[PDB]
CSV table of C-alpha atoms in Angstrom, one decimal:
chain,number,residue,atom,x,y,z
A,1,UNK,CA,-20.7,-7.2,-4.6
A,2,UNK,CA,-17.5,-8.1,-6.5
A,3,UNK,CA,-15.0,-9.9,-4.3
A,4,UNK,CA,-11.2,-9.9,-3.9
A,5,UNK,CA,-9.2,-12.9,-2.6
A,6,UNK,CA,-5.4,-12.5,-3.0
A,7,UNK,CA,-4.4,-14.6,0.0
A,8,UNK,CA,-6.1,-17.4,-1.9
A,9,UNK,CA,-5.9,-17.2,-5.7
A,10,UNK,CA,-2.1,-17.5,-6.4
A,11,UNK,CA,-0.3,-17.1,-9.7
A,12,UNK,CA,6.8,-15.4,-17.0
A,13,UNK,CA,21.9,-16.5,-16.6
A,14,UNK,CA,21.0,-15.0,-20.0
A,15,UNK,CA,17.8,-12.9,-20.7
A,16,UNK,CA,15.4,-15.1,-22.6
A,17,UNK,CA,13.3,-12.1,-23.7
A,18,UNK,CA,14.6,-8.5,-24.3
A,19,UNK,CA,12.3,-5.5,-25.0
A,20,UNK,CA,13.6,-2.5,-26.9
A,21,UNK,CA,12.7,1.2,-27.1
A,22,UNK,CA,14.8,2.5,-30.0
A,23,UNK,CA,15.0,6.2,-29.3
A,24,UNK,CA,17.6,8.8,-30.2
A,25,UNK,CA,17.3,8.9,-34.0
A,26,UNK,CA,16.2,12.5,-34.3
A,27,UNK,CA,18.9,13.6,-31.9
A,28,UNK,CA,21.6,11.6,-33.7
A,29,UNK,CA,20.4,13.6,-36.8
A,30,UNK,CA,20.6,17.0,-35.1
A,31,UNK,CA,24.1,16.1,-34.0
A,32,UNK,CA,25.9,15.5,-37.3
A,33,UNK,CA,23.7,18.2,-39.0
A,34,UNK,CA,21.4,16.2,-41.3
A,35,UNK,CA,17.6,16.5,-41.7
A,36,UNK,CA,15.4,14.8,-39.1
A,37,UNK,CA,14.3,11.9,-41.3
A,38,UNK,CA,17.8,10.5,-42.0
A,39,UNK,CA,18.4,9.0,-38.6
A,40,UNK,CA,15.1,7.0,-39.1
A,41,UNK,CA,16.6,5.3,-42.1
A,42,UNK,CA,19.0,3.4,-39.8
A,43,UNK,CA,16.3,2.0,-37.5
A,44,UNK,CA,15.3,-1.3,-39.2
A,45,UNK,CA,18.8,-2.2,-40.3
A,46,UNK,CA,20.2,-1.7,-36.8
A,47,UNK,CA,17.4,-3.8,-35.4
A,48,UNK,CA,18.3,-6.7,-37.9
A,49,UNK,CA,21.9,-6.4,-36.7
A,50,UNK,CA,20.8,-6.7,-33.1
A,51,UNK,CA,18.7,-9.8,-33.9
A,52,UNK,CA,21.9,-11.4,-35.3
A,53,UNK,CA,24.1,-10.6,-32.3
A,54,UNK,CA,21.2,-11.7,-30.0
A,55,UNK,CA,20.5,-14.9,-31.9
A,56,UNK,CA,24.2,-15.9,-31.4
A,57,UNK,CA,24.1,-15.2,-27.6
A,58,UNK,CA,21.1,-17.6,-27.1
A,59,UNK,CA,18.4,-14.9,-26.8
A,60,UNK,CA,15.0,-16.2,-27.9
A,61,UNK,CA,12.5,-13.3,-28.1
A,62,UNK,CA,12.8,-9.6,-28.9
A,63,UNK,CA,9.9,-7.1,-28.8
A,64,UNK,CA,10.7,-3.7,-30.3
A,65,UNK,CA,8.7,-0.5,-30.2
A,66,UNK,CA,8.5,0.7,-33.9
A,67,UNK,CA,5.4,2.9,-34.1
A,68,UNK,CA,3.7,4.3,-31.0
A,69,UNK,CA,-0.1,4.6,-30.9
A,70,UNK,CA,0.6,8.3,-29.9
A,71,UNK,CA,2.4,9.0,-33.2
A,72,UNK,CA,-1.0,9.9,-34.8
A,73,UNK,CA,-0.6,13.2,-32.9
A,74,UNK,CA,2.3,14.1,-35.2
A,75,UNK,CA,1.8,16.1,-38.4
A,76,UNK,CA,-0.2,14.1,-41.0
A,77,UNK,CA,3.0,14.5,-43.1
A,78,UNK,CA,5.4,13.1,-40.4
A,79,UNK,CA,3.2,10.1,-39.7
A,80,UNK,CA,2.5,9.4,-43.4
A,81,UNK,CA,6.3,9.4,-44.0
A,82,UNK,CA,7.0,7.1,-41.1
A,83,UNK,CA,4.4,4.5,-42.2
A,84,UNK,CA,5.9,4.6,-45.8
A,85,UNK,CA,9.5,4.4,-44.4
A,86,UNK,CA,8.4,1.4,-42.4
A,87,UNK,CA,6.7,-0.5,-45.2
A,88,UNK,CA,9.8,-0.1,-47.4
A,89,UNK,CA,12.2,-1.2,-44.6
A,90,UNK,CA,10.2,-4.3,-44.0
A,91,UNK,CA,10.4,-5.7,-47.6
A,92,UNK,CA,14.2,-4.9,-47.7
A,93,UNK,CA,15.0,-6.7,-44.5
A,94,UNK,CA,12.3,-9.4,-44.8
A,95,UNK,CA,14.6,-11.9,-46.6
A,96,UNK,CA,17.6,-11.2,-44.4
A,97,UNK,CA,15.7,-12.2,-41.2
A,98,UNK,CA,13.7,-15.0,-42.7
A,99,UNK,CA,16.8,-16.6,-44.3
A,100,UNK,CA,18.4,-16.8,-40.8
A,101,UNK,CA,15.3,-18.7,-39.6
A,102,UNK,CA,13.8,-15.7,-37.7
A,103,UNK,CA,10.0,-15.7,-37.0
A,104,UNK,CA,8.2,-12.4,-37.3
A,105,UNK,CA,5.0,-11.1,-35.6
A,106,UNK,CA,3.4,-7.7,-35.5
A,107,UNK,CA,1.4,-6.4,-32.6
A,108,UNK,CA,-0.8,-3.3,-32.8
A,109,UNK,CA,-4.1,-2.1,-34.4
A,110,UNK,CA,-3.4,-3.2,-38.0
A,111,UNK,CA,-6.8,-2.1,-39.4
A,112,UNK,CA,-5.8,1.6,-39.0
A,113,UNK,CA,-2.7,1.1,-41.3
A,114,UNK,CA,-2.5,1.6,-45.1
A,115,UNK,CA,-3.9,-1.4,-47.1
A,116,UNK,CA,-0.5,-2.1,-48.7
A,117,UNK,CA,1.2,-2.3,-45.2
A,118,UNK,CA,-1.6,-4.6,-44.0
A,119,UNK,CA,-1.0,-7.0,-46.9
A,120,UNK,CA,2.8,-7.0,-46.5
A,121,UNK,CA,2.4,-7.7,-42.7
A,122,UNK,CA,0.0,-10.6,-43.2
A,123,UNK,CA,2.4,-12.2,-45.8
A,124,UNK,CA,5.4,-11.7,-43.6
A,125,UNK,CA,3.7,-13.3,-40.6
A,126,UNK,CA,2.5,-16.3,-42.6
A,127,UNK,CA,5.7,-17.2,-44.4
A,128,UNK,CA,7.8,-17.0,-41.2
A,129,UNK,CA,5.4,-18.5,-38.8
A,130,UNK,CA,7.2,-21.9,-39.0
A,131,UNK,CA,10.7,-20.6,-38.4
A,132,UNK,CA,12.5,-22.0,-35.4
A,133,UNK,CA,15.2,-19.3,-34.7
A,134,UNK,CA,14.7,-16.0,-32.8
A,135,UNK,CA,11.2,-14.7,-32.5
A,136,UNK,CA,11.0,-11.0,-33.5
A,137,UNK,CA,7.9,-9.1,-32.3
A,138,UNK,CA,7.4,-5.6,-33.9
A,139,UNK,CA,5.1,-3.2,-32.0
A,140,UNK,CA,3.4,-1.2,-34.8
A,141,UNK,CA,0.5,1.1,-33.9
A,142,UNK,CA,0.8,-0.4,-30.4
A,143,UNK,CA,0.5,0.8,-26.9
A,144,UNK,CA,0.2,-0.5,-23.3
A,145,UNK,CA,-3.2,1.1,-22.8
A,146,UNK,CA,-4.4,-0.4,-26.2
A,147,UNK,CA,-3.3,-3.9,-25.2
A,148,UNK,CA,-5.2,-3.9,-21.9
A,149,UNK,CA,-8.3,-2.4,-23.5
A,150,UNK,CA,-8.5,-4.9,-26.4
A,151,UNK,CA,-8.1,-7.7,-23.9
A,152,UNK,CA,-10.9,-6.2,-21.7
A,153,UNK,CA,-13.3,-6.0,-24.6
A,154,UNK,CA,-12.6,-9.6,-25.6
A,155,UNK,CA,-13.3,-10.8,-22.1
A,156,UNK,CA,-16.5,-8.7,-21.9
A,157,UNK,CA,-17.5,-10.2,-25.3
A,158,UNK,CA,-17.0,-13.8,-24.0
A,159,UNK,CA,-19.0,-13.1,-20.8
A,160,UNK,CA,-21.9,-11.7,-22.9
A,161,UNK,CA,-21.9,-15.1,-24.8
A,162,UNK,CA,-22.0,-17.3,-21.7
A,163,UNK,CA,-18.5,-18.5,-22.3
A,164,UNK,CA,-17.0,-17.3,-19.0
A,165,UNK,CA,-18.2,-16.1,-15.6
A,166,UNK,CA,-17.0,-12.9,-13.8
A,167,UNK,CA,-15.2,-15.0,-11.1
A,168,UNK,CA,-13.1,-16.9,-13.7
A,169,UNK,CA,-11.2,-13.6,-14.4
A,170,UNK,CA,-7.7,-14.0,-13.1
A,171,UNK,CA,-4.1,-13.3,-14.1
A,172,UNK,CA,-3.7,-16.3,-16.3
A,173,UNK,CA,-6.9,-15.7,-18.2
A,174,UNK,CA,-6.2,-12.0,-18.8
A,175,UNK,CA,-2.7,-12.9,-19.9
A,176,UNK,CA,-3.9,-15.2,-22.7
A,177,UNK,CA,-6.0,-12.4,-24.1
A,178,UNK,CA,-3.2,-9.9,-24.5
A,179,UNK,CA,-1.2,-9.4,-27.7
A,180,UNK,CA,2.2,-9.7,-25.9
A,181,UNK,CA,2.1,-12.8,-23.8
A,182,UNK,CA,4.1,-15.0,-21.5
A,183,UNK,CA,7.1,-15.3,-21.2
A,184,UNK,CA,7.4,-11.5,-20.5
A,185,UNK,CA,10.6,-9.4,-21.0
A,186,UNK,CA,13.4,-10.2,-18.5
A,187,UNK,CA,15.3,-7.0,-19.6
A,188,UNK,CA,14.2,-3.7,-21.1
A,189,UNK,CA,16.6,-1.5,-23.0
A,190,UNK,CA,15.8,2.1,-23.9
A,191,UNK,CA,18.4,4.1,-25.8
A,192,UNK,CA,18.6,7.9,-26.0
A,193,UNK,CA,18.8,9.0,-22.4
A,194,UNK,CA,15.1,9.2,-21.3
A,195,UNK,CA,14.1,7.2,-18.2
A,196,UNK,CA,10.4,6.4,-19.0
A,197,UNK,CA,8.5,3.6,-20.8
A,198,UNK,CA,6.2,5.9,-22.9
A,199,UNK,CA,3.2,3.5,-22.9
A,200,UNK,CA,5.0,0.4,-24.2
A,201,UNK,CA,4.0,-2.8,-22.4
A,202,UNK,CA,2.4,-1.9,-19.1
A,203,UNK,CA,1.2,-5.3,-17.9
A,204,UNK,CA,4.2,-7.2,-19.3
A,205,UNK,CA,6.8,-5.2,-17.4
A,206,UNK,CA,5.7,-6.0,-13.8
A,207,UNK,CA,9.0,-7.8,-12.9
A,208,UNK,CA,11.3,-6.6,-15.8
A,209,UNK,CA,14.8,-5.3,-15.1
A,210,UNK,CA,15.2,-1.7,-16.5
A,211,UNK,CA,18.4,-0.6,-18.2
A,212,UNK,CA,18.6,3.0,-19.6
A,213,UNK,CA,21.6,4.2,-21.7
A,214,UNK,CA,22.6,7.5,-23.2
A,215,UNK,CA,23.9,5.9,-26.4
A,216,UNK,CA,21.7,7.0,-29.3
A,217,UNK,CA,20.1,4.1,-31.2
A,218,UNK,CA,22.2,4.5,-34.4
A,219,UNK,CA,25.4,4.3,-32.4
A,220,UNK,CA,24.2,1.2,-30.5
A,221,UNK,CA,26.4,-1.8,-31.2
A,222,UNK,CA,27.4,-5.3,-29.9
A,223,UNK,CA,29.6,-3.9,-27.2
A,224,UNK,CA,26.8,-1.8,-25.8
A,225,UNK,CA,24.5,-4.9,-26.0
A,226,UNK,CA,26.9,-7.2,-24.1
A,227,UNK,CA,27.4,-4.3,-21.6
A,228,UNK,CA,23.6,-4.4,-20.9
A,229,UNK,CA,23.6,-8.2,-20.6
A,230,UNK,CA,26.6,-8.0,-18.3
A,231,UNK,CA,24.8,-5.4,-16.3
A,232,UNK,CA,21.7,-7.7,-16.1
A,233,UNK,CA,23.8,-10.5,-14.8
A,234,UNK,CA,25.2,-8.3,-12.0
A,235,UNK,CA,21.8,-7.6,-10.5
A,236,UNK,CA,20.9,-11.3,-10.3
A,237,UNK,CA,24.2,-11.8,-8.3
A,238,UNK,CA,22.9,-9.3,-5.7
A,239,UNK,CA,19.2,-10.4,-5.4
A,240,UNK,CA,17.1,-13.4,-4.6
B,1,UNK,CA,-13.1,-3.8,-33.3
B,2,UNK,CA,-9.9,-1.8,-33.7
B,3,UNK,CA,-9.3,2.0,-34.1
B,4,UNK,CA,-6.9,4.5,-32.7
B,5,UNK,CA,-7.2,7.2,-35.3
B,6,UNK,CA,-6.5,11.9,-27.2
B,7,UNK,CA,-6.9,8.2,-26.1
B,8,UNK,CA,8.6,22.3,-12.6
B,9,UNK,CA,7.8,20.4,-9.4
B,10,UNK,CA,6.2,16.9,-9.5
B,11,UNK,CA,2.6,17.0,-8.5
B,12,UNK,CA,2.4,13.2,-7.7
B,13,UNK,CA,5.2,11.1,-6.4
B,14,UNK,CA,5.1,7.3,-6.1
B,15,UNK,CA,7.4,5.5,-3.6
B,16,UNK,CA,8.7,2.0,-3.3
B,17,UNK,CA,10.2,2.0,0.2
B,18,UNK,CA,12.7,-0.9,-0.1
B,19,UNK,CA,15.9,-1.7,1.7
B,20,UNK,CA,14.6,-2.0,5.3
B,21,UNK,CA,15.6,-5.6,5.7
B,22,UNK,CA,19.1,-5.0,4.2
B,23,UNK,CA,19.5,-2.0,6.6
B,24,UNK,CA,18.6,-4.2,9.6
B,25,UNK,CA,21.3,-6.8,8.5
B,26,UNK,CA,24.1,-4.2,8.2
B,27,UNK,CA,23.4,-3.1,11.8
B,28,UNK,CA,23.1,-6.4,13.6
B,29,UNK,CA,19.3,-5.8,14.3
B,30,UNK,CA,16.5,-8.4,14.1
B,31,UNK,CA,15.5,-8.9,10.5
B,32,UNK,CA,12.2,-7.0,10.8
B,33,UNK,CA,13.3,-4.1,13.0
B,34,UNK,CA,14.0,-2.0,9.9
B,35,UNK,CA,10.2,-2.1,9.2
B,36,UNK,CA,9.5,-0.2,12.4
B,37,UNK,CA,11.0,2.9,10.7
B,38,UNK,CA,8.7,2.9,7.6
B,39,UNK,CA,5.7,4.8,8.7
B,40,UNK,CA,7.7,7.4,10.7
B,41,UNK,CA,10.1,8.0,7.8
B,42,UNK,CA,7.0,8.3,5.5
B,43,UNK,CA,5.5,11.0,7.7
B,44,UNK,CA,8.9,12.9,7.6
B,45,UNK,CA,8.9,12.6,3.7
B,46,UNK,CA,5.3,13.8,3.6
B,47,UNK,CA,6.2,16.9,5.6
B,48,UNK,CA,9.2,17.9,3.4
B,49,UNK,CA,7.2,17.1,0.3
B,50,UNK,CA,4.2,19.2,1.5
B,51,UNK,CA,6.5,22.2,2.1
B,52,UNK,CA,7.9,21.9,-1.5
B,53,UNK,CA,4.4,22.0,-3.0
B,54,UNK,CA,4.1,18.3,-3.9
B,55,UNK,CA,0.4,17.4,-3.7
B,56,UNK,CA,0.1,13.5,-3.7
B,57,UNK,CA,2.2,10.6,-2.5
B,58,UNK,CA,1.4,7.0,-3.2
B,59,UNK,CA,3.5,4.6,-1.2
B,60,UNK,CA,3.9,0.8,-1.4
B,61,UNK,CA,3.3,-0.7,2.0
B,62,UNK,CA,2.1,-4.3,1.6
B,63,UNK,CA,2.2,-6.1,-1.8
B,64,UNK,CA,-0.3,-8.8,-2.9
B,65,UNK,CA,2.9,-10.9,-3.3
B,66,UNK,CA,3.7,-10.8,0.5
B,67,UNK,CA,1.0,-13.5,1.1
B,68,UNK,CA,3.5,-16.0,-0.3
B,69,UNK,CA,5.7,-15.5,2.8
B,70,UNK,CA,5.3,-17.6,6.0
B,71,UNK,CA,2.2,-17.1,8.2
B,72,UNK,CA,4.5,-15.7,10.9
B,73,UNK,CA,5.9,-13.0,8.6
B,74,UNK,CA,2.5,-12.0,7.4
B,75,UNK,CA,0.9,-11.7,10.9
B,76,UNK,CA,3.9,-9.7,12.1
B,77,UNK,CA,3.8,-7.2,9.1
B,78,UNK,CA,0.0,-6.6,9.3
B,79,UNK,CA,0.2,-6.2,13.1
B,80,UNK,CA,3.2,-3.9,12.8
B,81,UNK,CA,1.4,-1.8,10.2
B,82,UNK,CA,-1.8,-1.4,12.4
B,83,UNK,CA,0.5,-0.4,15.3
B,84,UNK,CA,2.5,2.1,13.3
B,85,UNK,CA,-0.7,3.6,11.8
B,86,UNK,CA,-2.4,3.9,15.2
B,87,UNK,CA,0.6,5.7,16.6
B,88,UNK,CA,1.0,8.2,13.8
B,89,UNK,CA,-2.4,9.0,12.4
B,90,UNK,CA,-3.1,12.0,14.7
B,91,UNK,CA,0.5,13.3,14.1
B,92,UNK,CA,-0.2,13.1,10.4
B,93,UNK,CA,-3.6,14.9,10.7
B,94,UNK,CA,-1.8,17.7,12.7
B,95,UNK,CA,0.4,18.2,9.6
B,96,UNK,CA,-2.8,18.6,7.5
B,97,UNK,CA,-2.4,15.3,5.7
B,98,UNK,CA,-5.3,13.5,4.1
B,99,UNK,CA,-5.1,9.7,4.1
B,100,UNK,CA,-6.5,7.0,1.8
B,101,UNK,CA,-5.9,3.2,1.6
B,102,UNK,CA,-6.0,1.3,-1.7
B,103,UNK,CA,-6.0,-2.4,-1.9
B,104,UNK,CA,-8.3,-5.3,-0.9
B,105,UNK,CA,-9.4,-4.4,2.6
B,106,UNK,CA,-11.7,-7.5,3.0
B,107,UNK,CA,-8.6,-9.8,3.4
B,108,UNK,CA,-7.2,-7.8,6.3
B,109,UNK,CA,-7.8,-8.4,10.1
B,110,UNK,CA,-10.9,-6.8,11.3
B,111,UNK,CA,-9.1,-4.5,13.8
B,112,UNK,CA,-6.9,-3.3,10.9
B,113,UNK,CA,-10.0,-2.6,8.8
B,114,UNK,CA,-11.5,-0.6,11.7
B,115,UNK,CA,-8.3,1.4,12.2
B,116,UNK,CA,-8.3,2.2,8.4
B,117,UNK,CA,-11.8,3.5,8.5
B,118,UNK,CA,-11.0,5.7,11.5
B,119,UNK,CA,-7.9,7.1,9.8
B,120,UNK,CA,-9.8,7.9,6.6
B,121,UNK,CA,-12.7,9.9,8.4
B,122,UNK,CA,-10.4,11.8,10.8
B,123,UNK,CA,-8.4,13.1,7.8
B,124,UNK,CA,-10.8,13.4,4.9
B,125,UNK,CA,-11.3,17.1,5.7
B,126,UNK,CA,-7.6,18.0,5.4
B,127,UNK,CA,-6.5,20.2,2.5
B,128,UNK,CA,-2.8,19.4,2.7
B,129,UNK,CA,-0.8,16.6,1.0
B,130,UNK,CA,-2.9,13.5,0.0
B,131,UNK,CA,-1.1,10.3,1.2
B,132,UNK,CA,-2.3,7.1,-0.5
B,133,UNK,CA,-1.1,3.9,1.3
B,134,UNK,CA,-1.1,0.8,-0.9
B,135,UNK,CA,-1.9,-2.1,1.4
B,136,UNK,CA,-2.7,-5.5,-0.1
B,137,UNK,CA,-2.3,-4.0,-3.5
B,138,UNK,CA,-0.6,-4.7,-6.8
B,139,UNK,CA,-0.7,-3.6,-10.5
B,140,UNK,CA,-2.3,-6.9,-11.7
B,141,UNK,CA,-4.9,-6.7,-9.0
B,142,UNK,CA,-6.0,-3.1,-9.9
B,143,UNK,CA,-6.4,-4.0,-13.6
B,144,UNK,CA,-8.3,-7.2,-12.8
B,145,UNK,CA,-10.8,-5.6,-10.3
B,146,UNK,CA,-11.4,-2.9,-12.9
B,147,UNK,CA,-12.1,-5.6,-15.5
B,148,UNK,CA,-14.5,-7.5,-13.3
B,149,UNK,CA,-16.3,-4.3,-12.5
B,150,UNK,CA,-16.8,-3.5,-16.2
B,151,UNK,CA,-17.9,-7.1,-17.0
B,152,UNK,CA,-20.5,-6.9,-14.2
B,153,UNK,CA,-21.9,-3.6,-15.6
B,154,UNK,CA,-22.1,-5.1,-19.2
B,155,UNK,CA,-24.0,-8.2,-17.8
B,156,UNK,CA,-26.5,-5.8,-16.2
B,157,UNK,CA,-27.1,-3.8,-19.4
B,158,UNK,CA,-25.3,-0.6,-18.3
B,159,UNK,CA,-22.8,-0.5,-21.1
B,160,UNK,CA,-21.7,-1.9,-24.5
B,161,UNK,CA,-18.3,-3.2,-25.6
B,162,UNK,CA,-17.9,0.0,-27.7
B,163,UNK,CA,-18.0,2.2,-24.6
B,164,UNK,CA,-14.8,0.6,-23.3
B,165,UNK,CA,-12.1,3.3,-23.6
B,166,UNK,CA,-9.2,4.8,-21.6
B,167,UNK,CA,-11.4,7.1,-19.6
B,168,UNK,CA,-13.9,4.3,-18.7
B,169,UNK,CA,-11.0,2.1,-17.5
B,170,UNK,CA,-9.4,4.8,-15.6
B,171,UNK,CA,-12.4,5.6,-13.4
B,172,UNK,CA,-12.7,1.9,-12.4
B,173,UNK,CA,-9.1,1.6,-11.1
B,174,UNK,CA,-8.3,2.3,-7.4
B,175,UNK,CA,-5.3,4.6,-8.2
B,176,UNK,CA,-6.7,7.1,-10.6
B,177,UNK,CA,-5.7,10.2,-12.6
B,178,UNK,CA,-3.6,12.2,-12.1
B,179,UNK,CA,-0.9,9.6,-12.3
B,180,UNK,CA,2.6,9.8,-10.8
B,181,UNK,CA,5.0,12.2,-12.5
B,182,UNK,CA,8.0,10.6,-10.6
B,183,UNK,CA,8.6,7.2,-9.1
B,184,UNK,CA,11.4,6.7,-6.5
B,185,UNK,CA,12.6,3.3,-5.5
B,186,UNK,CA,15.2,3.0,-2.6
B,187,UNK,CA,17.4,0.0,-2.0
B,188,UNK,CA,19.2,-0.5,-5.4
B,189,UNK,CA,16.8,-2.7,-7.4
B,190,UNK,CA,15.7,-1.4,-10.8
B,191,UNK,CA,12.2,-2.9,-11.2
B,192,UNK,CA,8.6,-1.9,-10.4
B,193,UNK,CA,7.8,-5.2,-8.7
B,194,UNK,CA,4.0,-5.1,-9.7
B,195,UNK,CA,3.5,-1.8,-7.9
B,196,UNK,CA,1.5,0.2,-10.5
B,197,UNK,CA,1.4,-0.9,-14.1
B,198,UNK,CA,-1.4,1.2,-15.9
B,199,UNK,CA,-0.6,4.3,-13.9
B,200,UNK,CA,3.1,4.3,-14.8
B,201,UNK,CA,2.7,4.8,-18.6
B,202,UNK,CA,4.5,8.2,-18.6
B,203,UNK,CA,6.2,8.3,-15.2
B,204,UNK,CA,9.8,9.2,-14.7
B,205,UNK,CA,11.9,6.6,-12.9
B,206,UNK,CA,14.5,7.4,-10.3
B,207,UNK,CA,16.5,4.6,-8.6
B,208,UNK,CA,18.9,5.0,-5.7
B,209,UNK,CA,21.1,2.7,-3.7
B,210,UNK,CA,20.2,4.6,-0.5
B,211,UNK,CA,18.3,2.2,1.9
B,212,UNK,CA,14.9,3.5,2.9
B,213,UNK,CA,15.6,4.1,6.7
B,214,UNK,CA,18.6,6.4,5.7
B,215,UNK,CA,16.5,8.4,3.2
B,216,UNK,CA,16.6,12.1,4.1
B,217,UNK,CA,15.7,15.5,2.9
B,218,UNK,CA,18.9,15.7,0.9
B,219,UNK,CA,18.2,12.4,-0.8
B,220,UNK,CA,14.7,13.7,-1.7
B,221,UNK,CA,16.1,16.9,-3.0
B,222,UNK,CA,18.5,15.1,-5.3
B,223,UNK,CA,15.6,13.1,-6.7
B,224,UNK,CA,13.6,16.3,-7.4
B,225,UNK,CA,16.6,18.2,-8.8
B,226,UNK,CA,17.3,15.2,-11.1
B,227,UNK,CA,13.6,15.3,-12.2
B,228,UNK,CA,13.8,19.0,-13.0
B,229,UNK,CA,16.8,18.6,-15.3
B,230,UNK,CA,14.8,16.3,-17.6
């Protein structure tokens, strides 16, 4: 007998936290005739640009989907290129963000990554952990399923060590065990035309506003961003 | 412990049936008279869907968040749902629908529990469309009960931490594979409001301003046509 009691046990205007699915780079390359991998060169720069615009509007957190845990299903060549492209991009743009007082965290399974990428990530996190500006969270080898599973294993681990009882398990406890925690995204922006989440933040999106746009990520600028904020502010005007 | 190096017509449609109160306002009705259309409209949607070859519909009837309303609102909504279900379950069976409820049934009035059990047995032989009614249900709730269940098994020596994977978690949830291909929310809002979380990983989202009581065959066909061209 495991119980449920929901009637009892009760329980994260500018968006404070924006989540980003940065899609459309391969399409932006097909249009304009280049090779596939050229659009991907523009990802991390454009992200840094968006942090700057966001920082100046009063936005406090950005979580961005960089490398999906399903990308291991790509060719060993495509993935190995993407992990290299990313390690390079991080050291280029490290200074730019850190200088402007941005704090940087990585979420995902880091132990699967190349050892050089692991070392660069740990350095980046440590040197920016004191910064007081915008908080940039990079989802790298991350997924919604993964986050819920790692949290479940941690909870089972604690129960096995006598540190918690099965009836202590509630929304607040589970939330503290996830990699992406409160406060959750108020607005989610996916560029590139698709209208799905593709396994990026399942638990955290329970009350998030969804905004989908056909603009490809490389063409996405300040006007498109303020458009989406403006859109978000409309919905609060027609809802309690 | 960390390693991730396998973790047309829609077969399963999920439905957030919102806009009933707004509909009631725009027509000078009592605030909760719009809700009297919900189960009838759902039966209609089931019948159209069944004829198109859609196999499963999961519909959001009573959220775990509704408990935060006044006692009067809650007693009315649970009473109205028992009444609607008692009026329509034979009609639904005659359309070959099979009916399941997900959610925490132990918090419900005992007459509503009895009516749910009767509905399930009468229809569990049917081979038409499978209708899943989410009643005292939410996304957080499903993930948490699955977690508690897994913790209980580990305590009793029936599994190790290393056995916890996507398949194990899926079989402990109340809404299981196969997950919704398409989600439709009526009434204009563009959120999931803690309906399903784990199950929506790859679902297509379709939002419309149409209020639920005005939702017809044409509105459904647009939604499917829209889905096809993706």
